[PDB]
Design a protein around this nucleic acid. Structure first.
Lengths: 58, 142, 175, 211, 38
RNA sequence: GAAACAACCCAGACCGCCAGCUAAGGCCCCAAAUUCCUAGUUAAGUGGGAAACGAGGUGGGAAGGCAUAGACAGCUAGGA
RNA sequence: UCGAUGUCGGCUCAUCUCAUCCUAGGGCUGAAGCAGGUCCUAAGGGUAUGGCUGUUCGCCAUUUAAAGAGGUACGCGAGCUGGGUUUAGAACGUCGUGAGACAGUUCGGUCCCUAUCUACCGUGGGCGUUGGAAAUUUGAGAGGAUCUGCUCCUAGUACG
RNA sequence: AACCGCUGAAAGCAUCUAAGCGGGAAGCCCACCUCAAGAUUAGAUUUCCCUAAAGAGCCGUUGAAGACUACGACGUUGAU
């Protein structure tokens, strides 16, 4: 459920889940998929800023 | 902190138009199936329909590749002994144009009460016009 | 070889390409062919040199048929084509009245055949049909369709046959 | 393609001068009042709606009473509709008249009616099942169905299996029947054939579709 | 014609022609040389 | 995981967690994850049952024979 | 599967396959015609009655356009039958000293079940179908049906 | 479908095929007959009615309708 929610959130603004997790891993971001799916589903501004940090890292 | 569901009363379904003129049958059906399920939404929960209403025009102008127009077979059994029937993609598109795309999408959805509910939101028409201007569906190239 | 050979345009004829649709006009009439989407047609001084878009075996194979078909249209509008049919039989006879040719070969009923639009038939004698048309395709189908009512027999030669057509002959009552 | 509704009056014979007996049936043809004309614009298809016979007012509903009043015709015992085409909707206006004049002597017509009902019937009468031995040790299965299927494969009875059930009392059409004589002053229609149903039953007569 | 799993030209007036993905033999000399792979 | 499938592949369940990494297998939809990138092949839905044998499918690789002293095919003449 | 899955044949009722028996369309033919022979396509229909034998089969008689090959628990006994096989009686031949035995024969010899579920054939009740009602209807679809002889004429012509 | 083509290149020819245009079976899809909107996508048209209406049902007389039903006719303004 979290992965599907994260996949929808990343695809709304930019990249896919597979490139999102790689971006978070390269940026040393430890946020779990549970918290990420809650940010995506409940605060889209933060997830937009969170995708950018992953997008600039690749 | 908990992972919450979509609360059907709080979900809204958006209206879109897809012009299926010259697009590949299966390449488009996957896109429609995902939208009907609401996979593109961050509040997607597999037990709530969070999808969208998709209006498809030019359903007869949808295309298949290779030699599939003359060779894709649609079988059905009537329920009587020896009651097996078959028709072509091109013979079915000439007799029931919406049934070709409706049948690809139906097999790409879950098979159950929620699956029956989210195919009810696929309003597909043969021709360039649809009777849904009241819903003001936005154009969507998918 | 066929594709690279240019099509020479006589004085009367003229070819115009309007939206992937070759139109060949001249003295006999007007013929048209659909240009394949893998072939380009360029014109020079009273000659048509058509070449493939990309250098590929499939494009060189479709420009060979457009060259051949268009060359037939050029000659077919310059002086036209002509096919001759012969009737062999005790009572085999044909009569052409306008666009409809009637022929009584061997049936319990005369058969009536209406020529395709673009082919004309005249019968000088009663056992020899002469067909004339602009395009070789429609002339050939008209002759093949008349000849298919009663194709030649291999035991006596009876039946409608092409002029200068080798008809195989078999011997009845052999041992 | 339009016809008319009649009532079966019984069968008789018509003798020809050459000395042949023609098995005929008499069809009473009351006035067929046109109660509605359906067209491609209002209904999506072209048809003529007619009524015939009579009903007392106490037995006619208010909804039907207004349907007839718009046409301007008297309430008939029923309402029947005939599928038509543009040529058939020529002199057919609302409240018009359809007599036995629609048919001429020597014309093939199609007659439809409700067959006599035989009620529940067994396989022997309903489907021409062969009876089983009346003697030779046969137990209590003389008019039985026999086998109804195969063994474990397929392990069921196939759909459409011939079995006992209701026989007759169904819509049945007989084609290729000649019109022997037409008389319109007395509402007559003499037809060569059998005409499914009993005396008094409603029958529909249409021009033959085989042609 | 002969419709067999082995089709080959016999006399020398026979052609190997393929139409609709299927191998034929046509002979202008002998009509019983006509073959089709199947 | 192999559709379902004691014996095949990965892997040995103390219990709990709405944490993370991986194995076999996978990433268009059912169904989690690439409609990912690069260079090609296939046109048979081959892929997604089956051989001897047949064929002028198509791609590639080592060599060859002939050729503007006119090569291959066609046509004309001869073929005694 | 032995705390039981009834054997062969017949009857009744079937359902499917195609490796097609008839009818349909074709190529080749040592195809003149008429008739065929092969092979391709084709499963829509149709595809006998008897004598003998328990027989399936097979032989035979007479037909038919034809009398197809098969699967279906060698389809079908909670649908029927019970002739054979395969209980207990009896006998013959044969084997055994014998009790007995014989894919040897012969005469005789109890076939239960009121159908719950699935399936099927019919026929209803309920609710729904964006207020209710009386009628008429469109048709997504489903089923049924689909066979064939002979005579005349063309014409005793084509062919021979 | 098999089969037979027309024009036509790949492959100067040939070639039913690759582009394009035809013929062609009791077979397929319609056409005929019956059923059919529980086609939950539950369709359409014509009328009628809404402070218990329009109607439907019960009941009764019943029917070439029928196991019970259902369906059809009639109930005093009436031939059930």
């Amino acid at each position: 459920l979290w992965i599907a929610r994260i996949n929808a959130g990343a695809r709304l603004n930019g990249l896919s889940y597979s490139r999102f997790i790689n971006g978070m891993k390269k940026a040393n971001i430890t946020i779990d998929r549970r918290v990420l799916a809650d940010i995506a589903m409940h605060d889209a501004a933060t997830f937009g800023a969170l995708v950018e940090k992953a997008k600039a890292e690749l | 902190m908990k992972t919450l569901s979509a609360k059907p009363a709080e979900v809204t379904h958006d209206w879109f138009v897809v012009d299926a003129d010259g697009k590949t049958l299966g390449r488009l059906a996957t896109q429609i199936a995902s939208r009907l399920r609401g996979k593109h939404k961050t509040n997607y929960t597999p037990h709530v329909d969070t999808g969208d209403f998709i209006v498809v025009i030019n359903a007869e102008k949808i295309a298949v590749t290779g030699k599939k127009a003359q060779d894709k077979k649609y079988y059905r059994h009537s329920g009587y002994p020896g009651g097996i029937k078959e028709t072509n993609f091109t013979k079915l598109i000439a007799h029931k144009p919406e049934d070709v795309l409706h049948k690809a999408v139906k097999g790409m959805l879950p098979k159950g009460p929620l699956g029956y509910a989210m195919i009810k939101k696929l309003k597909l028409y043969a021709g360039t016009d649809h009777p849904h201007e009241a819903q003001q569906p936005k154009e969507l190239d998918i | 070889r066929v594709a690279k050979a240019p099509v020479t345009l006589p004085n009367g004829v003229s070819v115009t390409l309007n939206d992937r649709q070759v139109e060949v006009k001249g003295k006999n009439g007007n013929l048209s062919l659909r240009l394949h989407d893998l072939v380009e047609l360029k014109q020079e001084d009273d000659v048509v040199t058509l070449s493939p878009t990309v250098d590929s075996k499939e494009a060189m194979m479709h420009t060979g048929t457009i060259r051949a078909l268009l060359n037939n249209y050029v000659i077919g509008v310059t002086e036209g084509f002509e096919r001759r049919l012969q009737l062999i039989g005790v009572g085999y006879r044909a009569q052409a009245t306008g666009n409809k040719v009637t022929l009584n070969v061997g049936y319990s009923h005369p058969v009536e055949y209406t020529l395709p639009e673009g082919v004309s038939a005249e019968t000088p004698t009663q056992t020899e049909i002469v067909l004339k048309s602009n395009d070789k395709q429609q002339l050939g189908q008209a002759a093949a369709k008349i000849r298919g009512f009663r194709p030649p027999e291999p035991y006596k030669g009876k039946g409608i046959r092409y002029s200068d057509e080798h008809v195989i002959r078999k011997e009845a009552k052999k041992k | 393609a339009i016809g008319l509704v009649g009532k079966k009056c019984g069968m008789t014979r018509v003798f020809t001068e050459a000395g042949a007996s023609i098995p005929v049936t008499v069809v009473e043809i009351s006035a067929n009042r046109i109660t509605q004309v359906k067209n491609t614009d209002v209904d999506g298809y072209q048809a003529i709606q007619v009524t015939t016979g009579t009903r007392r007012d106490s037995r006619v509903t208010a909804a039907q009473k207004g349907h007839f009043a718009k046409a301007g015709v008297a309430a008939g015992r029923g309402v029947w509709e005939f599928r038509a085409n543009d040529s058939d909707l020529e002199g057919r206006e609302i409240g018009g008249e359809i007599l036995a004049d629609l048919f001429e002597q020597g014309q093939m017509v199609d007659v439809t009616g409700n067959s006599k009902g035989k009620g529940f019937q067994g396989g022997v009468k309903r489907h021409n099942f062969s009876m089983q031995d009346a003697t030779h040790g046969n137990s209590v299965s003389h008019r039985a169905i026999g086998s109804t299927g195969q063994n474990q494969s397929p392990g069921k009875v196939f759909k459409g299996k011939k079995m006992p059930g209701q026989m007759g009392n169904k819509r049945v059409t007989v084609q290729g029947l000649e019109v022997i004589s037409v008389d319109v002053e007395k509402g007559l229609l003499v037809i060569k054939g059998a005409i499914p149903g009993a005396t008094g039953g409603d029958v529909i007569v249409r021009p033959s579709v085989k042609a | 014609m002969k419709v067999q799993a082995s089709v080959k030209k016999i006399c020398g007036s026979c052609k190997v022609v393929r139409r609709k993905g299927r191998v034929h033999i046509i002979c202008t000399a002998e009509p019983r040389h006509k073959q089709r792979q199947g």
